[PDB]
Amino acid sequence: RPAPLTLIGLGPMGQAMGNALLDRGHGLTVWNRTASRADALVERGAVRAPDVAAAVAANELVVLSLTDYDAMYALLGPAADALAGKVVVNLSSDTPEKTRAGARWIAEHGGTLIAGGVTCPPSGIGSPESSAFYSGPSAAFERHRETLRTLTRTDYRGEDPGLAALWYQIGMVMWWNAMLGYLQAVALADANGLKAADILPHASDTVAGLPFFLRFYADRIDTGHHGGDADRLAMGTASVEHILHTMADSGVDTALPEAVVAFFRRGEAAGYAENSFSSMVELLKKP
Amino acid sequence: SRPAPLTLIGLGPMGQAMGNALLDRGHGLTVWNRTASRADALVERGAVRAPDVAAAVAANELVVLSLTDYDAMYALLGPAADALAGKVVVNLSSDTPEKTRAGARWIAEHGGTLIAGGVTCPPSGIGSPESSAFYSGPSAAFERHRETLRTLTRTDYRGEDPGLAALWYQIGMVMWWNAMLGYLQAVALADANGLKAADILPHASDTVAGLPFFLRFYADRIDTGHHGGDADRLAMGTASVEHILHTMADSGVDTALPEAVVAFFRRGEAAGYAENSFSSMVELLKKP
Amino acid sequence: RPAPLTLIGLGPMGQAMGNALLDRGHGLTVWNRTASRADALVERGAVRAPDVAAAVAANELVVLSLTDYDAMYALLGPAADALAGKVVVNLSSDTPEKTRAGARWIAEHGGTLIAGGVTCPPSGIGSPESSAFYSGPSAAFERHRETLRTLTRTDYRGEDPGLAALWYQIGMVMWWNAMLGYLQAVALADANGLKAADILPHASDTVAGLPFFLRFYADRIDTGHHGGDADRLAMGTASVEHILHTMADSGVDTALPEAVVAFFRRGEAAGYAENSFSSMVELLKKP
Amino acid sequence: RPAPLTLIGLGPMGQAMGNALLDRGHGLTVWNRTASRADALVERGAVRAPDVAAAVAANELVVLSLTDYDAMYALLGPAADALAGKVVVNLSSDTPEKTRAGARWIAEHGGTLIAGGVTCPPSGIGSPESSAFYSGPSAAFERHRETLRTLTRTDYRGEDPGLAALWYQIGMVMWWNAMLGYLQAVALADANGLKAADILPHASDTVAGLPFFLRFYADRIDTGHHGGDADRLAMGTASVEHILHTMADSGVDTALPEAVVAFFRRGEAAGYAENSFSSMVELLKKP
Numbered sequence A, C, D: 001r002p003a004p005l006t007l008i009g010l011g012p013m014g015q016a017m018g019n020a021l022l023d024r025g026h027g028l029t030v031w032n033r034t035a036s037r038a039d040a041l042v043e044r045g046a047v048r049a050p051d052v053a054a055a056v057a058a059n060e061l062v063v064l065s066l067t068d069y070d071a072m073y074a075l076l077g078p079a080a081d082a083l084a085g086k087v088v089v090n091l092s093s094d095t096p097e098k099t100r101a102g103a104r105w106i107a108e109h110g111g112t113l114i115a116g117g118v119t120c121p122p123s124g125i126g127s128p129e130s131s132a133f134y135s136g137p138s139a140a141f142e143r144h145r146e147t148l149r150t151l152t153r154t155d156y157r158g159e160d161p162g163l164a165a166l167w168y169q170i171g172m173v174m175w176w177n178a179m180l181g182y183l184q185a186v187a188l189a190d191a192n193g194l195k196a197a198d199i200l201p202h203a204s205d206t207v208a209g210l211p212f213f214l215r216f217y218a219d220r221i222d223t224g225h226h227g228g229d230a231d232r233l234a235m236g237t238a239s240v241e242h243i244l245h246t247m248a249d250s251g252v253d254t255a256l257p258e259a260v261v262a263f264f265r266r267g268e269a270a271g272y273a274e275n276s277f278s279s280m281v282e283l284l285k286k287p
Numbered sequence B: 001s002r003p004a005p006l007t008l009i010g011l012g013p014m015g016q017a018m019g020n021a022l023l024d025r026g027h028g029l030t031v032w033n034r035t036a037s038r039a040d041a042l043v044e045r046g047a048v049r050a051p052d053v054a055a056a057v058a059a060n061e062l063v064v065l066s067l068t069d070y071d072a073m074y075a076l077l078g079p080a081a082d083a084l085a086g087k088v089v090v091n092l093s094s095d096t097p098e099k100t101r102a103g104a105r106w107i108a109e110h111g112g113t114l115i116a117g118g119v120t121c122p123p124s125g126i127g128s129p130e131s132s133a134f135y136s137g138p139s140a141a142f143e144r145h146r147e148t149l150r151t152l153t154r155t156d157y158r159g160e161d162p163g164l165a166a167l168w169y170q171i172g173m174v175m176w177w178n179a180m181l182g183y184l185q186a187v188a189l190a191d192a193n194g195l196k197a198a199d200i201l202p203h204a205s206d207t208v209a210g211l212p213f214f215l216r217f218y219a220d221r222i223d224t225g226h227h228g229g230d231a232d233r234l235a236m237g238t239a240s241v242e243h244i245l246h247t248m249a250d251s252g253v254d255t256a257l258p259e260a261v262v263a264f265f266r267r268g269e270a271a272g273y274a275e276n277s278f279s280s281m282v283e284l285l286k287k288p
């Protein structure tokens, strides 16, 4: 039987979360700084709380979908003394350190923070294939897990609130870097009469073969094997210089390929030319 | 009827795999490498060791090169460059389209024909039907040597311009290197938190497997200039990349690569794109 | 923290599965009808359970890799009452309805069935490139997902156990038809002095261009667009007659090509000659 | 540079062929039994031939895009004696033996027939990645090869005109079987509330993983290795039975899946049950 809950934060993720909760039949109380972002949900049956404090008071479960944890202090700070007995499921990105700071704040005001990292876009909220990392007090998470199953599948990573944020950041460094490479490929294509649609099949093939290299290098990096049997860093330095010069010749911004070339040059200056590019995970483990 | 003979110059990871696949099929293979040790197994398997690069070029009309760059072709084939007349040089080496076009003009000045190639597979993929390579250059020479080239990978001919195969290779490699640099950063962040690459491999594999959906979602949006903040705002993304930078700094992990990503996203915000999708950053990367 | 589990079914797929589970670090207990198939696995560190019951009792997670769901009854039947509190992940092919029956049977004995459909060959078990459809009670899937992620990536389709079987059959009808076409082309080639290796490049190109046609026809079929702008069915009827007669003139068996001609002739008999071959989806569709 | 030519047959392929030849600057003379199907190409700048006989006399090169070779005899037979010194490039599908008979017929009238098998849809005409098999006298083909390169890449397969047709059918038996498998997947999907767009990703991954299996079985079939290393026919006969029954339980036509199950039952009757499904090529091969 769908338990009622409050949702604060109605950007792309929160609007989708509200629609999924209203589809399962959860009594929903919503609040958003931009009051107009709640209009469609309230027309579908969501209750518009007149203020943030009334949203927190409406239910024990308060789900937050905000840009970061500073936004949580900005919205919940005025009525922080009424956070007693409340379970705050923060589905906002932040560092493990700031996520732990938010958990301390909520606890010092009588509440319980469960940290969440949703690994799906808005279109994936409510879909069975979607998942979210969850960390923080086990008992409070277990009590509200069934409601959270409406949004995504739940993946508990442990009692430390910082864990859900670490696992989110581990995936997002891969996602953002891959997507910035796509934006760079689309720009190179544009300068050469090619649209994103023209490069889509090749771009999709490039990313669809990446799991092979993830396993290939995982086994080796863990065993400390950085041999140049499949690849040598010097060949990669040339490849990335070719990218930089190809983009500059085509009039495309070079700031991001210049940083890549700088990284490969630091690997050669460390004596890794005949080793795999994987050898540079050692430069990364260094502050 | 029978696999054609050919010369292969360049016996590093890719060339070694190419020679093996060419012999596995039944091609008469003449080989040559600067480090002669790398031809030992291929010669044992039945290949002819050319004595001095020139002899290798003279051995066959088809000369396939697997070198680090196009400068390496000039260094090896320059001494006997006048004997390149009538020869078809398939350069499977990475380089800028402009340097690839310069290589083609040099081969042409010496009476030869250059076919440019960009192999989109690792050594383990040479010989596999799954693997492909970009090809560009004079159609007749490509069409004449295609069957032999299909032993190595599938052939994707992009046109008569030799620079086309290099452009398409660079388009895919900027994506590949950036994704794999993110993987190395994820492995380092993981190591600093007691996690091996094997512990994060499930999540890393899911993250890269969901990427084809996002390439399709943003393709039409970027092509139509639709950069609305309906699915995402650059300001949210700037916070996200800042969280990566600081999660990595708090874990003692090198921050030069995440600092470049944060600087890129903060430059978009300072140019008026904060309420737009991160896709709008292609407008700052583009030429106009 | 690699959790322990039991694997029953050590045929081509099960052997690879136990192979990957041991490589990852899982405490594996195994069992097979032909005991000799567990030899290598026990040498590598697996516990050979003396009987089926002991296999089930060793761990909560019991994974089955068998030809069908009938084999689950034959093996787990005798000690079915001890299936209480056990989660049975059945990675065995069967119909959605037979998969749904097995789930009810397991719940009658106090267990929980999670249905699975592995879309990879034995060589791909353990590879991040491989995936599997999973369907069944979400909470039991969430509890055992990390262990199932050792075999392949996990694609949860929903609570209905029949969903993982439906998604598997949707792909296998394409896979089997495509590979029966390969066997036919190899036979045609053989009858004309060409080995499979001689036609392998053209066969690979033919299958590599298929995603384009799948996308081209998807929106068309979904929207009822069966116009003959790219192709007419009468042209296709001649193409498949050309295939049948090429095979007949070369002495190749013609049962499979005659069935293809028969289907296209049914398309013509229904008034679809000037329409795209796509029109024949309406002959296959449920009324 | 762009040589003049005649195009007869303006259905989907010939319309795209004509548009590509006019785009390059080729002087084009067109003719179609349905005169109206030339209207657009004539307004684009092609000359309308009053009769097939004049179309043939207009140029040495006569390209045909017709359903089959019976259409060549019907259209060109009346003025066949005026085919002397003409190069007829027939891009029409037919059996190798009927293509060889068409070449003898053109040669009896003093012309030369070049057989063609275009391996691209109409959207691929003019694309550098598109290709066409070509067979027949090398001299005549190599005289007009550059004009044919405007349509697709030219792949010469040899002097026998039947070779282009054989290589075409080798690929088309794979293409048709894969696409009929797709139509069936789409019908099973529709019966279960799933559109083609919902199954398109899995369908695309299924057909893109096929080149691995093409290589796996190519080597094995050529050396007669048909062991159950990766698969057993009996497991496969159950898989195809699961497909047949899944489709029956969902109300989908079972004619094509029945033909597949019958073929697998012939393999089990030959004692191949414990062998690879690859063993069923011996059932198809010419005695």
Ligand SMILES: NC(=O)C1=CN([C@@H]2O[C@H](COP(=O)(O)OP(=O)(O)OC[C@H]3O[C@@H](n4cnc5c(N)ncnc54)[C@H](OP(=O)(O)O)[C@@H]3O)[C@@H](O)[C@H]2O)C=CC1
Binding pocket: A008, A009, A010, A011, A012, A013, A014, A032, A033, A034, A037, A065, A066, A067, A068, A070, A071, A074, A075, A091, A092, A093, A094, A118, A119, A120, A121, A122, B231, B232, B233, B235, B236, B240
């Ligand atoms: N978008 C995506 O695809 C995904 C994002 N995420 C994560 O989920 C979170 C939310 O995502 P998304 O919906 O895109 O987020 P946005 O950053 O676009 O906005 C989320 C909400 O935060 C509110 N907000 C931000 N700053 C403040 C502040 N100082 N005071 C008050 N309210 C504030 C916004 O209010 P207002 O409506 O007034 O602007 C909005 O409702 C992020 O942390 C993101 O990393 C998770 C996975 C996917």
Ligand SMILES: NC(=O)C1=CN([C@@H]2O[C@H](COP(=O)(O)OP(=O)(O)OC[C@H]3O[C@@H](n4cnc5c(N)ncnc54)[C@H](OP(=O)(O)O)[C@@H]3O)[C@@H](O)[C@H]2O)C=CC1
Binding pocket: A230, A231, A232, A235, A239, B010, B011, B012, B013, B014, B015, B033, B034, B035, B038, B066, B067, B068, B069, B071, B072, B075, B076, B092, B093, B094, B095, B118, B119, B120, B121, B122, B123
């Ligand atoms: N490695 C990979 O996975 C892939 C790489 N590629 C591309 O293929 C090409 C080949 O790279 P790869 O096979 O990895 O190997 P390398 O680039 O490491 O070496 C290739 C060959 O070049 C030779 N060489 C380099 N510089 C010179 C020189 N100045 N004079 C003479 N010979 C020279 C080497 O000789 P020696 O043996 O004596 O060192 C070696 O045989 C590159 O352009 C690369 O971008 C394509 C796709 C995948």
Ligand SMILES: NC(=O)C1=CN([C@@H]2O[C@H](COP(=O)(O)OP(=O)(O)OC[C@H]3O[C@@H](n4cnc5c(N)ncnc54)[C@H](OP(=O)(O)O)[C@@H]3O)[C@@H](O)[C@H]2O)C=CC1
Binding pocket: C009, C010, C011, C012, C013, C014, C032, C033, C034, C037, C065, C066, C067, C068, C070, C071, C074, C075, C091, C092, C093, C094, C118, C119, C120, C121, C122, D230, D231, D232, D234, D235, D239
């Ligand atoms: N093989 C493949 O490439 C793939 C197959 N699959 C699916 O996975 C499942 C297993 O595959 P695969 O390993 O090839 O299967 P097999 O049918 O070849 O063998 C699987 C196991 O089932 C056991 N078994 C079969 N029938 C019975 C029975 N009546 N009673 C008891 N045990 C029985 C066999 O025991 P014993 O050793 O004693 O014979 C064997 O260990 C199938 O459902 C298949 O559709 C999934 C994707 C790929």
Ligand SMILES: NC(=O)C1=CN([C@@H]2O[C@H](COP(=O)(O)OP(=O)(O)OC[C@H]3O[C@@H](n4cnc5c(N)ncnc54)[C@H](OP(=O)(O)O)[C@@H]3O)[C@@H](O)[C@H]2O)C=CC1
Binding pocket: C230, C231, C232, C235, C239, D009, D010, D011, D012, D013, D014, D032, D033, D034, D037, D065, D066, D067, D068, D070, D071, D074, D075, D091, D092, D093, D094, D117, D118, D119, D120, D121, D122
């Ligand atoms: N369409 C495709 O995607 C591909 C098809 N092909 C092959 O190319 C050929 C052309 O196919 P497509 O372009 O689709 O067109 P069709 O096969 O549907 O028709 C082609 C032309 O043949 C003519 N024609 C057919 N029968 C006769 C006859 N008895 N007498 C006179 N003219 C006749 C038609 O004239 P009318 O206008 O009067 O009907 C039409 O212009 C086929 O052999 C096909 O296998 C190869 C590659 C891809």
